[PDB]
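User: I'm putting together a teaching handout on how multi-component assemblies are represented. Below are the sequence lines for each component of a complex, exactly as they appear in our records. Could you produce the 3D structure of the whole assembly as structure tokens, so the students can see both representations side by side? Please keep the chain order the same as the input.
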Amino acid sequence: KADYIWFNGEMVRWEDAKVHVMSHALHYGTSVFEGIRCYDSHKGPVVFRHREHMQRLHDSAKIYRFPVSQSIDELMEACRDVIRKNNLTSAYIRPLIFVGDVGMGVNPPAGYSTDVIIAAFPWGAYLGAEALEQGIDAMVSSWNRAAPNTIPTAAKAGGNYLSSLLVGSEARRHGYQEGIALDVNGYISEGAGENLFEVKDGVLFTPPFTSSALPGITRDAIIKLAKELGIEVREQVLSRESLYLADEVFMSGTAAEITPVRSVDGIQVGEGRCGPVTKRIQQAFFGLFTGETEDKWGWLDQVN
Amino acid sequence: KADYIWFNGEMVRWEDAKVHVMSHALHYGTSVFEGIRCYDSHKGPVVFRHREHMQRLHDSAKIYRFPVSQSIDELMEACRDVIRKNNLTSAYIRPLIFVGDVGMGVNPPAGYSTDVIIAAFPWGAYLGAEALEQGIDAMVSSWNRAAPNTIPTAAKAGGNYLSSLLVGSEARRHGYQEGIALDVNGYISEGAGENLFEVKDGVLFTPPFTSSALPGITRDAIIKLAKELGIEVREQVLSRESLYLADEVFMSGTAAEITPVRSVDGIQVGEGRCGPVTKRIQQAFFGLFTGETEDKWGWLDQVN
Amino acid sequence: KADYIWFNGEMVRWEDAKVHVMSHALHYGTSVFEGIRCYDSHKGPVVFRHREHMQRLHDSAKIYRFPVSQSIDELMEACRDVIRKNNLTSAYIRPLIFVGDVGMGVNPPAGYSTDVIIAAFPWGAYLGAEALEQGIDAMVSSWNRAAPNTIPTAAKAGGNYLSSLLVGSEARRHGYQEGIALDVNGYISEGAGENLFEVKDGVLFTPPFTSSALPGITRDAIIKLAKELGIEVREQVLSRESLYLADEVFMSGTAAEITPVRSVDGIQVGEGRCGPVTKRIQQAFFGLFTGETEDKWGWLDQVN
Amino acid sequence: KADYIWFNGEMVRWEDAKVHVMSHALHYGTSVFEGIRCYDSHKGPVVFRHREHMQRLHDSAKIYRFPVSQSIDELMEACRDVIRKNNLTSAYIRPLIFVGDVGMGVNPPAGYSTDVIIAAFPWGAYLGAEALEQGIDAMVSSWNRAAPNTIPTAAKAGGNYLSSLLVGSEARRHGYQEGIALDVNGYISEGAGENLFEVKDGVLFTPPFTSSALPGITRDAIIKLAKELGIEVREQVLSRESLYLADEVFMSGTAAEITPVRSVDGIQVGEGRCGPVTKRIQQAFFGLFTGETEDKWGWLDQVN
Amino acid sequence: KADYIWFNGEMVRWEDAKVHVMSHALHYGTSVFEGIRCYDSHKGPVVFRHREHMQRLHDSAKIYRFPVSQSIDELMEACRDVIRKNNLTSAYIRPLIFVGDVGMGVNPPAGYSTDVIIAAFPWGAYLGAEALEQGIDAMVSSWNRAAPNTIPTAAKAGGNYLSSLLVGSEARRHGYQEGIALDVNGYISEGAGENLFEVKDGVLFTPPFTSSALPGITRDAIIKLAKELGIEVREQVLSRESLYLADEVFMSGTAAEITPVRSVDGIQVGEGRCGPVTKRIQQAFFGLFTGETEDKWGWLDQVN
Amino acid sequence: KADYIWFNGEMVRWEDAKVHVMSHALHYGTSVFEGIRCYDSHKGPVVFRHREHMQRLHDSAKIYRFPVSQSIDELMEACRDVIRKNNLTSAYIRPLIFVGDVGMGVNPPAGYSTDVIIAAFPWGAYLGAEALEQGIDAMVSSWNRAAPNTIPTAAKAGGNYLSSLLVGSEARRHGYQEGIALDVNGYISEGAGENLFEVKDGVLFTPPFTSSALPGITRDAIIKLAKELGIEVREQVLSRESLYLADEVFMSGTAAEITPVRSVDGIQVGEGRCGPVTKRIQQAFFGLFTGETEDKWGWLDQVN
Ligand SMILES: Cc1ncc(COP(=O)(O)O)c(CN[C@@](C)(CC(C)C)C(=O)O)c1O
Ligand SMILES: Cc1ncc(COP(=O)(O)O)c(CN[C@@](C)(CC(C)C)C(=O)O)c1O
Ligand SMILES: Cc1ncc(COP(=O)(O)O)c(CN[C@@](C)(CC(C)C)C(=O)O)c1O
Ligand SMILES: Cc1ncc(COP(=O)(O)O)c(CN[C@@](C)(CC(C)C)C(=O)O)c1O
Ligand SMILES: Cc1ncc(COP(=O)(O)O)c(CN[C@@](C)(CC(C)C)C(=O)O)c1O
Ligand SMILES: Cc1ncc(COP(=O)(O)O)c(CN[C@@](C)(CC(C)C)C(=O)O)c1O
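Assistant: Of course. Below is the structure of the complete assembly, with chains in the same order as your input.
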């Protein structure tokens, strides 16, 4: 909840940000969105990997051929505007491009244009306030993630989340904090809404995009940070049993940030606490907003 | 376009049927819908297999665990009310159950309730004016339909249509009227938004639900009508080549009704016109609204 | 627990029925077994489908090429002997053919012979004393059953049960009575140790053997009984969603007999009680031992 | 054959190491085991990678949730005791953890404990006397290895060997020394009871664990030794054809050690004798027991 | 070997029927062919299911879009011509449509035409002279048949036989008469060059076309003959183990006719001789050329 | 077209290089071939990677067990002979080993020998004259490439091209210059007759052989050239969406050389012209024939 939402170029009051119930996206899942985070840092409010997220928004729209009238820079300026206009120092930003009030035909008529929305509001830890220090208990779901050439997993589209809803709800229904999904082959894909990382003998390990894992921006940042710390990273297909033999396992995402997993299916993950490597990575990631970790890549975009 | 839309129990004017842009379904494809048709018949306006569609709406919501406060009878009465209220004699009804303005978390908070909408409006033939008499040209898409244990194909949910959008747009981009999708195994599934039927040596043939084909109500009706006409029906897995060797091939759906396919991938389907068996079935189906075909199953529900 | 166990042709006291710890089967799962039931009936103690079970024992041994010195008749006579010698009127018989104390090489040396054991003892309802009247709550497991050309599912071999152990324990760990496994394709296979049956519009439905479902003797009996009752039976591949849309669903097995399933994954199966068709079948099956159902197939083998 | 066998903490005479015929593991393949080797070296009898094998025994039991009361150190001391007690200088040790005399239900009753055994005895080369110097003839089996999410291949459990029995017997029935299995996808997995290695243009090559290949300890040792010799190692999925195009191909295992493969399916592997790289690795491996190869990893555990 | 070959409408002497070495089909497998048999019967030389085979030739060419200038009737007349011209009373006819001397590009240039050839010559029992009375020993091959949507198995094209070459040679290399191939899923497909049939409890059984089994003309005839004899036929997916449990198993094809299989993988198929049902079908099939079996379908086409 | 063709050791005139119409390869696709190029360079006519191509010819024949009487050196000398005899300075060489006039049985009789042919002739740009400078528009085909253990993709055999014919003709039928095929899993395999390369953030990327991609000689050369230019190369499985997100994409082959792809499915590949990295690689490749790029590997074989 906040005061204004950027809607097609205009700052509209949150309560007046309405759309017709016959909007295409409500019926067909025809929307593309992002998850960006604004952090209060040593140099004021800063949007983490702002450009990268807006570029992915365009990429997701490009795969579905959704016409986007706004350039990446326009969207970035609009994003900063929303944060300032609402007087937020830290928040969760949510850009959403959707097919609006067009016909009821699955295929939108030629010459149509999409509606764009950017909402920002403060949001806590996605998996619990105590999830970052003490781990979470995860469960391997009975539902598998989308097959390779069906519904593109590289795109962050609305319709994709019926799957995340099934995987995540099954875990919570049985008392776990999050569910881990396997692909159609029986290999580890990722969590319901976050990438998965293991740690064996001091080595990282993450499933490639071909395991139906979305190319997370946080995932990418962790791989680059790991290389700075001198930790070997391996991007390979992982079996289900590896979760039980791993020394450490954690999840990554914009909302989830870096959450350690202390157990999988009731089987404790070495010690049952946040591990050594996960700790180093957490410190290095959060150190970006304290100044301790030098921003060598230009990941911090000042809101002003 | 029409006058009123049934919205959570109230007949609201079309222009005022708005919902918040932060509605869950807009971001995560969390909606379930139906496609129903009202025909002007020999006994006045009648809704084809009304109860069956309403029962499927409940079944689709049940799989996803979406709470539905309205009973099947309540929805049916509401449906007839929409048609009468708008003075429609024939139309396309569109029931939609969606997760509204709840949090931004993938899993809605316990105790939430869904919003329901029922909109009716006149709609012509889905594949074209001439489509029913002269066939359509179809193309086998390069995109496959959802794998078995990923996103349930038996449910008619919003998020499912990202796939239908990809299959159908590819066909139309290349000059065809509709696209035919194969499942992940390489067998025939169905069209982008309609079931597929073949006709070999006087025998029907349709893919089973396990070929990722949705349990169509029109599909079911055709199978029952064929049995009355003494036509042998076979529900079996079909290979791609079968489309080139079939004497006849047609598609079924609420919007598409019964549309013959005159060619697949530029390869003509026996004669290039509507076939004999397809013709008999079309006459038997439309005969229900003329009185020529006796409604032995009670598929015609009077609007009054 | 009982007094004697038939061991290689001799009635040995239960406590002296020992075998060396270096027996091949203990290390490599190299054993084949059966589950037979003795019922107290209107014509005294009777072994249900005795010959069929012994024939399957030979078939399972034949697939693995295990040498069996005893003929089907010898094993049947030995079986009756064990029941009489222990003064049992009703019991669970357990024939077991295993590779004994041979070398430690995976492949037994040429000219080796197997050890045979037949133990009988009273055993109650496998899924609970109240499981037959009121249903059980089942869960779809995250573990899949064996792929088609890996470890033959038609054979009832020891090593097969590591899978049943994984599927069944996961269900019980989460509060369910039994787990239902899908095959590698994402289709319904069967329960951890029992075949699965659904009931839609008055029609049965069971997965074929090709869905990695073991050719159960109880399953076969139910299909033949159903045909006598005039119920249509369909042996076809079933999707996971079908469990949620079914009017009735039950499990079959020698130990489980005919157990109705009142819910799958927390989703109630029409009414939440034993259904109409399942009831008819239960009455018809148990009626065999009361005389109400005529044994037209010769399924009851008198112990004497 | 030897004098004593460690049985649940006691050194029992070989002849008296018996267990009941109703032991769970005999009927359901519920056991986990290891293969360890004691070599007579330049520093006396030494167990190769002792702790590593004991840790894997615990990992295999962990996946199946089998309760193990003994710690890794306890098992190691017990192992050395068995070797000393039997006056062995070189032998094959066989640790076995199995579900004993509990009920006949697939799932053991809560609070049960497992029986543990450790037997040692001298064993020659698994594939033959000449096998190490002259290669062996291998055949690609018609039976595939277990699919990814069915029965965990990372675990060395009893029931797993029904597959190894099928693959290996087929090869020997046709005149070959060992069989090579493909996974369900058609890629190379491993031999019936040993890992597979190829050698192309001076580069190693081995299938990853995700190809249903067990994480062999010998496999791991070879990878580490190769890196010391400056040989490039590549863990990647290999097609069947690669076996015909490889310059060298060999198998690894505790029992098989390092055995070269001179031909696959009657097609000679470059020269038909042990290759250059295989030779270097064999000399480096056996050099550990001569002192020529320095034990930089601490793989040699003294028995005393 | 014979005197004349029909080549593009001309009766050319066998020795002069040559084609350039740069013919497309020689480098790219771009050919489509048939196998037809002429039998000496009670009504003189007759071509078994002549029209059906010519219709399939056109169908195979249609799938690949090879232009065929000759009508089905022209090809049939040409076939009878070849038989007469060579004074044959019984023979094996071989129609072949191939892409000739066009460019070396994979895709032939627009406006090209195909070359057609029809050769007839006497040919004995495909699987051996004694194969029809005493069975043959078959082996399950380690090579799988083509996946569903790759190279159409419904078409009888030249390039398809690289697979048949691999499956068949592997069997013969090991002492068997024919090889049985499985599909990519691990189910029974068919023999290297003939359809596979099983016989369980008096019931037939054959894999559907979707198991990568070619729609054989002999296969079709046998299904129609069996229905006349009152034998139940089931077209379903078959597991590998079913070959070991079947009472009878035989293969069908134009060249192989109806050949019983007495063993599969060294495992005897009930009695090890031609079974009862196979015998009835053989007598019914060959009875067509003696007059004993009435030709109700018009399968015998007179050569004159 | 040229004057002479090397045929079984003899220089035969082009017009007289004929083979019988009953040649095995014409009916069963039993042939193996290569594609080699001769370039006019700074040191005169030179055959690019001559030995490598002849070695692959032998490898392809070895897989199918086709007897080859000529050694690699004999074939190389014969190749140079053909070029000289025809007075060619630049040409496309085509070695072809095929099963000739043997029986009509799928498996050739023991003791048979193959026929060998080497034809050379000038051939232009495979994908078009302008294709090397301006890119080509490609389409993702609806036909998939051969599954892993069916018809070996590592071999360049005649029968393989029925697949290439289907993939390539579909693209050209819709207005594209070439078709890109996916494997049975839905991952990128390669073009109809050329390997596929992507370029993301300055990094290469190519599918491994296990994605049913033929081990191209040009592909290998490009990987080695890129390593010289200091460009990172990654051999990994690629998803379909990656084609839309790539900065650059190009195809490689002997006939196609190095062809940039400016669009895939109507979606422009960054700028729509030949990219920076592709350009550097093209210049480095063609520089080998100008002397600008030093031949460190000995890829240029002088014709003399
Ligand atoms: C399915 C899925 N996989 C990974 C990620 C993480 O990507 P990234 O944010 O770019 O590092 C997500 C992201 N989920 C978001 C968009 C939604 C929440 C989980 C509600 C987010 O974390 O911002 C994903 O959904
Ligand atoms: C993917 C898909 N498959 C089948 C059917 C036909 O079902 P039915 O109407 O029950 O016979 C459809 C139906 N789609 C509807 C609901 C929506 C249109 C595509 C807009 C319809 O035809 O009314 C389907 O989508
Ligand atoms: C995996 C599996 N599937 C089916 C059946 C039922 O077969 P049947 O007894 O012949 O009708 C079983 C059988 N399990 C037995 C052998 C063991 C118990 C479950 C402990 C049995 O019911 O007797 C099976 O295991
Ligand atoms: C299926 C399988 N795969 C690999 C290995 C080799 O592992 P390792 O000994 O750890 O290098 C094996 C090992 N099998 C043992 C344990 C049993 C024999 C086959 C009897 C062994 O070689 O000692 C395996 O089975
Ligand atoms: C792969 C394959 N499958 C079935 C059949 C049988 O078809 P049909 O003759 O129509 O019953 C065949 C046919 N093979 C022929 C064409 C060639 C011989 C094996 C050499 C034949 O039998 O005539 C097939 O190849
Ligand atoms: C299917 C396929 N894949 C890759 C290549 C490229 O191999 P290479 O020439 O070794 O780099 C080819 C090669 N195709 C040739 C043989 C035929 C033309 C396409 C007509 C060629 O380029 O020379 C291939 O076919």
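A couple of points students might notice: The radius of gyration of chain E is 20 Å. Residues C 106; D 35, 156, 164, 190, 193-195, 214, 216-219, 252-256 surround ligand 4 (CB under 6 Å).
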